[PDB]
Amino acid sequence: AAKDVKFGNDARVKMLRGVNVLADAVKVTLGPKGRNVVLDKSFGAPTITKDGVSVAREIELEDKFENMGAQMVKEVASKANDAAGDGTTTATVLAQAIITEGLKAVAAGMNPMDLKRGIDKAVTAAVEELKALSVPCSDSKAIAQVGTISANSDETVGKLIAEAMDKVGKEGVITVEDGTGLQDELDVVEGMQFDRGYLSPYFINKPETGAVELESPFILLADKKISNIREMLPVLEAVAKAGKPLLIIAEDVEGEALATLVVNTMRGIVKVAAVKAPGFGDRRKAMLQDIATLTGGTVISEEIGMELEKATLEDLGQAKRVVINKDTTTIIDGVGEEAAIQGRVAQIRQQIEEATSDYDREKLQERVAKLAGGVAVIKVGAATEVEMKEKKARVEDALHATRAAVEEGVVAGGGVALIRVASKLADLRGQNEDQNVGIKVALRAMEAPLRQIVLNCGEEPSVVANTVKGGDGNYGYNAATEEYGNMIDMGILDPTKVTRSALQYAASVAGLMITTECMVTDLPK
């Protein structure tokens, strides 16, 4: 269709103006004195929230260009939350900061490409500085403390998480379900988790988790791309009968079929969700079979001449629960026989000896790790349905937080880590003045989150930033008690992974925008 094409400065302010709507909507929730944002619904009462992700999801602008700007930042910023369970909002305020200052500089006549490299150099430098600043999280005592802090000072949640990690390990898979009647339960079941998410958002039935959740579903394992729902029909009806949901795990699900599934499940005609099979090539077929033995199903491959039209429930695998993320599928309690599973583990353990290269060793060990490791299951108990559901939510949060803590440690929260790291890179330089300006841009931008938090608290950003800049390490002033001491000790911390992700991703999109000359979109009519 006829397009609207904008260039240079004209195009850049549009994008900027766009990111401003987004950032300004979202940053008011930042910090403990976060304000509320009211999101209108069709009919009924509007939603009042302090959750920046909820807010971002809703943002879409009328001016197509401003919209593109908002959608760009929205996209990359969401990745931070995906990776570490937080920092989306931070990433957003940061992205705003970099883009504003960067465009100022572009307008002053500085080179966009050099500005970008300067900003990037600053960020890599900052990530290193962040690792040095980081305090490790290894013994289960520390795991419990982090879990507790993320859980709103609840010892119970920390203990729970600690206990579970104690069961399956730091690298283990931990899941959360409704409790059966007050008093928590922990149990390790047969289960697995592979890095593939939903083939489409429409499949989501947990808009809170942004996830798909299926109970006691059947699992179709097909080694081939499924493009047409013609082959699906017989197995779809067998699942419509017995009224259970269905997880399809194929090489891929495309076109006719994917669309048809997205519609049918979204009209209540059988709950279905599809995900690509993990990995690619040979190891993909291997892992498909792994999933087959584990769920007690039969992998239907065209290679040996099997056909989907010729498949009954019996070929289908089975599990107590499956949960699907944007990039993660996790199978909980497969119906597979102890003999079958342990026998498959045995086989895999034979190939590792008869192996050759190191790569082949790692890969095989990853497979048994999945197989033999299992899945910890935390059922949260709590006296009331309401409290139970709530405590369940806080456990989920504390969980992602703790996992991220375990991976890369913790640093001072309240936005001070980004400020300390920045104060340390004052002498950092690049190849020419432009790159140097790029660097200052980024280091100044790293102050945005703290400043906004302070602003929201009704204090003077400059003064607080100064106070913070004066000290060192994770040492600070506890706003709640105004006591000086170690921020981590006083419970004001962030998983190093969240701060890092936020910074890098913010820098990524802001860099891109700063280096954009042209925008093309459809015509407003």
Add this chain to the structure above:
Amino acid sequence: AAKDVKFGNDARVKMLRGVNVLADAVKVTLGPKGRNVVLDKSFGAPTITKDGVSVAREIELEDKFENMGAQMVKEVASKANDAAGDGTTTATVLAQAIITEGLKAVAAGMNPMDLKRGIDKAVTAAVEELKALSVPCSDSKAIAQVGTISANSDETVGKLIAEAMDKVGKEGVITVEDGTGLQDELDVVEGMQFDRGYLSPYFINKPETGAVELESPFILLADKKISNIREMLPVLEAVAKAGKPLLIIAEDVEGEALATLVVNTMRGIVKVAAVKAPGFGDRRKAMLQDIATLTGGTVISEEIGMELEKATLEDLGQAKRVVINKDTTTIIDGVGEEAAIQGRVAQIRQQIEEATSDYDREKLQERVAKLAGGVAVIKVGAATEVEMKEKKARVEDALHATRAAVEEGVVAGGGVALIRVASKLADLRGQNEDQNVGIKVALRAMEAPLRQIVLNCGEEPSVVANTVKGGDGNYGYNAATEEYGNMIDMGILDPTKVTRSALQYAASVAGLMITTECMVTDLPK
């Protein structure tokens, strides 16, 4: 879709303006000299009313932002009426008062959060003050007086409610029905009531009480979530035959199945209603059985390997009447055998002995209380249908009132309670000057209802407020006779609960609005 986003001061005026349209419409009916509001109906003559609830129900504004404002207070204020049977209007005027002053303070540059915390502190104090000010309503002589006062001086209503409460206990379940023909009738039948409401406002066949009413229905007890209407069919065809209505009580009823029930019932193709089973986890499966025993039905659990396709009318439970609210299901006169039920009570009472915890004892007693407790049924007689229907309403209202009186007592009406309580908190202070301003805002707002009542009466609010502030205890201003004196004795009272609720809910919404920085809504298309 493309959104319209408003910020800070801009959003807040819009919200204000919107709660102003709402409050101004409802607050004219406050007190004894309340005015009429005329609500148009598309077909026929308009409705003239003085009921703040009916008026509020109709308010929806064209401006999307202003509208969100109104819908917000509309919602929480509504909850006040739902909790204590009155005070929605009061809640609305209070909210208006708090919001108006609060936004004035925000505009002056004071911190919204500190304003909120000050408001809350004042309210917290006021509620305690309200507890002290409160006079208990315990002996049935008192119960009768309150009911009598709520019924417009109708002593017969007081007596009826007093008798009904003595039959089933203060905490018992009491219901109101049409008369057989003059001379009321009272009788205790097998029955039960759990706190779960309609899974949809479309199951409602009694739009005035906003309730579902099924007479001689079958009760399906299914321990599991019902998502697809395919399993229902065999049992649904058996109930279409025998031409009796159907109550489905499951773990939940979702999408396909629920939408199909909502449609088929709204088309007279068989009357049906669905509610979640009470509670969760184990105790939920236990209570489902309690209901089974009570109604002479069979719990259909997939767990034990039972199927809905194979369930017959014989498995269905039965009762003379069930009534469903927004959050209550009450079963009246179940076909349960007076031996089955007694046995069930017996087994449970034995479990109370084997009980290893206090919690377990309390929770099991609730079950015996429900089963063994039963249900009082008051049938209002009156000589001609019209009179009967009017008195039935008065009995229903007075009943709800009297319940609230029994729980937290009663306090001075006519808005004087709030004013008395505010005058006692003159020395209340916060952590900084802003919080002190927040407290003053709340205490000043507590005068709003009285002032409005007085305004509606055509007197000078300041003068009356002033004199009242001068008094002590439950001494106040009788708006109907223009006479000052002891309010409770003069029969001008409110259940402590309604005053408390209205205050709390108003303060709640008011805090949210005061601390709102952003609003996102659709574009006016």
Add this chain to the structure above:
Amino acid sequence: AAKDVKFGNDARVKMLRGVNVLADAVKVTLGPKGRNVVLDKSFGAPTITKDGVSVAREIELEDKFENMGAQMVKEVASKANDAAGDGTTTATVLAQAIITEGLKAVAAGMNPMDLKRGIDKAVTAAVEELKALSVPCSDSKAIAQVGTISANSDETVGKLIAEAMDKVGKEGVITVEDGTGLQDELDVVEGMQFDRGYLSPYFINKPETGAVELESPFILLADKKISNIREMLPVLEAVAKAGKPLLIIAEDVEGEALATLVVNTMRGIVKVAAVKAPGFGDRRKAMLQDIATLTGGTVISEEIGMELEKATLEDLGQAKRVVINKDTTTIIDGVGEEAAIQGRVAQIRQQIEEATSDYDREKLQERVAKLAGGVAVIKVGAATEVEMKEKKARVEDALHATRAAVEEGVVAGGGVALIRVASKLADLRGQNEDQNVGIKVALRAMEAPLRQIVLNCGEEPSVVANTVKGGDGNYGYNAATEEYGNMIDMGILDPTKVTRSALQYAASVAGLMITTECMVTDLPK
């Protein structure tokens, strides 16, 4: 009257916008391939010119703010020409460049004051570098060469000027007037020149040179301030009679007296010009006497009790000619008798002996130098009045050029000296990054003249500039034989004084505009 007030950025763009009309109008004439500017006359045939100064005179913009910008640059830049006989256009283009880049910098958030400091530091350095680059004009051979070059390669003009400077010394006063008919004449006559200019532009009757030129005028010497034309009348009727023009040298000429004089001379009722008497305090009374002696006039001192009403034509001084600049008055061929003048000189020489202070001695020495030295008078011959007037004009300009050359030397022309000097200061830095940007702003601007010249010649500016930067000393870009080489020998030069002035004034106004935050002007009424 009610004003229109503009602040910050908004004000700055108006100013810039304004200087841009002036600069763009003026700069097209720069260089040897300068284009024509057509300036419309009162009404007659338009005037076509390549003289940037003429063009500048004519520029006045409708918009009050824009006009203010342009007038400010006109004013500061005009001084360059006043001082060194060239450089105004250059100053203007330099001013445009500095203001342009400076304002970009201010908008990007840099501190105007630090930018100004930087610009100034760069200019200070550049001046020194310019002195270092400069070649002396000391021997009369070089004096003649410069004269010849500035007179379009006319050896005659060079010879003539050299002869003149030889008679009165290089610091002597040299005058040029109409020749008596082919064959030049050079004679030294009794005369003087002091540092006071016309008290009003309206006095100018030679717009070409922006000078007042009086023939056989009478000279009124009044040791007092003349504010009212009532005391003038008697002297003015005498001068009105006799029918010769009038020069007034008083302590000052203000108000009614000045106003009236300006009107009258602009209405042919006696040609009159007024200047402040030279110096101040006591030495002013002394010099007034010097002039008196020289012109055979009599000082009219109120101190001694003399009155202007009693002043006669005989009290008045006389000379064959007087010429008045913006800041110079030069009396040519006084009538005073040699005996008198000589006696005066004797007196001063003796006071020079008696002088008890270096200062006093110096001042006295300055005075005898003026009286005893006289004035050189070049009469330019030609054969045909037309060639005569033209040559006379060339001699005036060349004269001014060589004067400046004699003072501070010559540097490479065509804008190369400025670029050269700029390339030498690459490492120049200030106290902070803002100052540093100020410096670069200045250094880039120093290229503007040459680049503009190249531009007018239809070449790529950047290429030529880059080349010139590659070379050393007085190597650069020619346009007559179009080939790079040695500028001085090749006869492409500028007096160091014009280059220095052009740069310094340009920097001055630019600094001032860059540091402007507020502008006040009348409403367009």
Add this chain to the structure above:
Amino acid sequence: VEDALHATRAAVEEGVVAGGGVALIRVASKLADLRGQNEDQNVGIKVALRAMEAPLRQIVLNCGEEPSVVANTVKGGDGNYGYNAATEEYGNMIDMGILDPTKVTRSALQYAASVAGLMITTECMVTDLPK
């Protein structure tokens, strides 16, 4: 791999020349004395040769340098030699990994000239009325 493949295929077919758009300028600088049958054709010739500079100029413009300056520098050298578009070392562009398959530069030139030539000789255009 797919990209490198097409590239190498093209390399094998017709060889490689200096990349960065310099090949075009060199080629252009060699045709300074090239003439046609009349002044108009000669102008056509200049238009084309001047045009052959557009890519470098743009490339340089994108790098934030002065297109005229680099073009000038490039015009001064010969063969596949010159300006190092990353390390400022002089040498053979092909060896320093700065190349384009001769096929790609030639194609771009011929196709460009083709369409431009058609448009330059266009006198009339016919299209639908905006509905």
